[PDB]
Design a protein around this ligand. Structure first.
Ligand code: CA
Ligand code: CA
Ligand code: CA
Ligand code: CA
Lengths: 373, 376
């Protein structure tokens, strides 16, 4: 029986702090100037944030306010005290962003699979559901002693490609110093985080009766975030996408405006793949787009259905570029990408989100595909 | 009948800002390991216009090496070739800030490795060719053949595959920094074709890849005089697909540079490359993805899974059985057997960690082929 493990992290993980700050700067600029060009990278370490990169924008007032946007995001994450390892109101904030006033050979992958309602691979889907729920129970006061930093890991056993057993769940979370790990943290996390997520999913074949749950296996986790650590933007690209289950062409998402094809074309390929499986044309699919210098539209569109197609895969390949307009400008227009919608994507995955509606997750092309067959 | 598949991968030179960071992070690692082989290192680097910021955490007895980190940083930048503001960056005069916490002295995981007989080095062809080109691009700068070149650069390779055979080199893009006085059409383009593209193709001598109609584009966006961190920013661990298999294989996550070998994200990824390469070299498959599964509380893997994509010459179940008999995949054993507690990492920080034809790395040795053949 094959095992597969994926992980997720909360918004309080230092690498995710950086992704969120980078995309908070992006959203701030897009809110005032939708055509801003942005390439913003964030570093955090003990007591400090360093935001660098380049921007072309007319949004000078938003640019001036970046320092405050940074602090506010850190406070929203929940870092508001040195006791927690980090305080957005009093940490160091340094800005080294160059500012001015105003194709390529490419491959990009997308993936979808009918193993979850959100059409994601089960290990990453479950890991993200758990990291989101972990944060939710902190913020809604159900478990008020929790602190922001955390990580989830999910190992599933498969038999002939069917997920049959939930093998291991690891949940590591930051928490107040007075909390008993064995008699308070562990059962609260089992009841309020693991069991609620498993009930939400109600998976048809995943046996969770003998799951090994480990909560804070390395013990006390009182201080977290950048304290005694460091984070950078774009260091969780597998967490951001498919958890290792699918191939990745390279390129991080956060801090990049939608003109960056690494972001927008990856989003488009997810959209294509999700609509293909939701249309029942395959149970799982990897979609690959090929772009060439000097041509807007793709020079190639390839799929792999792993034996699960219900129609000829060559037919699927033919109809995708008829149904979808995969020119970069069309993707931007059609998904309405020149809007401040990115800070929300910077933790808990860019794909398969059950808590927010994202343009590239909409099943608005299922009918189109069915008509084209 | 399906249209031929296209696949593109890319590589960057040691002068690309993200690779500058990988190199600085691993140069700090090597400096520490040279004095204290058991140093714990998690060192991240940021560069932007005129400045380097090195952060993270270290546990080491190598206090003299730690004190010298600022000089190690400057020396790496100068070795890359950034020695002037005219080039965008000067290792001797740029800002260098160190914010590293210093002190004196398992996990649920999955990691992938891959190999394939599409190249001599048993790497996927698009990334192998991209890396050979980026290495050669740097080589002709440093050896004086094309002395007007400057450090920053990028290569991209698009190949057409028909029924899994690489049949055509579709496009090669070579983007390189250079001196201001250089004629792009009449000097740079023909020099790059002759000294970089043609030499690499002749070295490779690929039996099926037709290069007679290759579209070569040299600096398609024009002049590239200033580069590196100038008007840009780089960070450690932002080229993980360049570092590995160029998108051809699955990646479990985790960057390499700035991490000592106790980090399983690095050492177990290296071990999986070693396993996959030996499996293919032993004739057990033409291509293979190897997946190792670790559990909290157990040193040895709880699973070892392979995918041979229909190319196995023996039962894949048998391959799965013999791998953990022949390879000791306990983290402590990988570290000992590959001799990882040595200053060998700065060299890995550009041009790929896998498939290197210019340097001999422990995880690329075919010293387990005989063992595998005896176990069948
Ligand atoms: Ca059901
Ligand atoms: Ca529709
Ligand atoms: Ca041997
Ligand atoms: Ca024997």
């Amino acid at each position: 029986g094959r095992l597969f493990t994926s992980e997720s992290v909360t918004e309080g993980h230092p690498d995710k702090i950086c992704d969120a700050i980078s995309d908070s700067v992006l959203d701030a600029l897009l809110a005032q100037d939708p055509r801003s060009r942005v390439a913003v990278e964030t570093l955090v370490t003990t007591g400090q944030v360093h935001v660098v990169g380049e921007v072309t924008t007319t949004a000078k007032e938003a640019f001036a306010d970046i320092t405050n946007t940074v602090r506010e995001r850190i406070l929203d994450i929940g870092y508001d005290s040195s006791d927690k390892g980090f305080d957005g109101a009093s940490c160091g904030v340094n800005i080294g962003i160059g500012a001015q006033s105003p194709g390529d050979q490419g491959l990009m992958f997308g993936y979808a699979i009918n193993d979850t309602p959100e059409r994601m691979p089960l290990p990453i889907a479950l890991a993200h559901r758990l990291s989101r729920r972990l944060t939710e129970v902190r913020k809604n006061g159900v478990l008020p002693y929790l602190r922001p930093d955390g990580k989830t890991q999910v190992t599933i056993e498969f038999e002939d490609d069917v997920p049959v057993r939930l093998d291991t769940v690891v949940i590591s979370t930051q928490h107040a110093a007075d909390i008993d790990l064995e008699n308070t943290l562990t059962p609260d996390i089992r009841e309020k985080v693991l069991n609620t997520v498993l009930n939400d999913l109600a998976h048809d074949t995943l046996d969770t009766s003998s799951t090994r749950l480990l909560v804070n296996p390395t013990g006390k986790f009182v201080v977290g975030g950048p304290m005694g650590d460091a984070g950078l933007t774009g260091r969780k690209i597998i967490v951001d996408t498919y958890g290792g289950w699918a191939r990745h062409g390279g390129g991080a998402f956060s801090g990049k405006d939608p003109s960056k094809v690494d972001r927008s074309a990856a989003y488009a390929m997810r959209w294509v793949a999700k609509n293909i499986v939701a249309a029942g044309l395959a149970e799982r699919v990897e979609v690959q787009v090929a772009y060439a210098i000097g041509k807007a539209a793709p020079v190639g569109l390839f799929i792999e259905t792993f034996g699960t197609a219900t129609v000829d895969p060559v037919k699927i390949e033919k109809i995708v570029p008829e149904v979808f307009d995969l020119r970069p400008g069309a993707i931007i227009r059609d998904l309405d990408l020149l809007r401040p919608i990115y800070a929300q994507t910077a933790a808990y995955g860019h794909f398969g989100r059950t808590d927010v509606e994202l343009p590239w997750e909409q099943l608005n092309k299922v009918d189109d595909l069915k008509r084209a067959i």
